[PDB]
RNA sequence: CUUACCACUUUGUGAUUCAUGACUGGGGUGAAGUCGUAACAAGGUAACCGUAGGGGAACCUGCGGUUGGAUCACCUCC
């Protein structure tokens, strides 16, 4: 009810956390540590070979992991995560 | 002798019913004829129902309806 109006407070897309994962899916993660708050993280990022990474692969159930917003959509309400930036840049 | 009632019988106009009739509508059956291929597979434009118009023929097209229809819907939110 409350958390998604003033979603300012970590809306700068240069803005990262540390969160926790909750399930994976083969397209993703979401990482919700937020609480009543998730990211995604989509399958493309997470590393740096594209798709060539199951999900199930980089990261498993219950671990915390270090991630930037990119792109909150204040309505349809998703904010897009990515892992493979904070980390490396071969 | 006469009046009344009344059978035979006569006339007029209807109803119903059987037969027959130039010509004409469709229906059934038929190894092997002609024209095509409408349906059954997504039957090669999914089919079908009501209705309307059109076309040698099966049919075609419009409007609404039905599933008694294959394959079924798009990058990332559980
Ligand atoms: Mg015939
Ligand atoms: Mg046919
Ligand atoms: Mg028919
Ligand atoms: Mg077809
Ligand atoms: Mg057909
Ligand atoms: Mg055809
Ligand atoms: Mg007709
Ligand atoms: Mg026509
Ligand atoms: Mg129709
Ligand atoms: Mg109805």
Known sequence: ?????????????????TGRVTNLTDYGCFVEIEEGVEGLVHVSEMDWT???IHPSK???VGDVVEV????????????????????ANP
């Open 68 to 87: 930037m917003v990119l792109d909150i959509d204040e309505e349809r309400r998703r904010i897009s995560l990515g892992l493979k930036q904070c980390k």
């Open 1 to 17: 009810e409350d958390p998604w109006v003033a979603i300012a407070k970590r809306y700068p897309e240069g803005t990262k956390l």
């Open 58 to 60: 980089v990261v498993n």
């Open 50 to 52: 594209n798709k060539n």
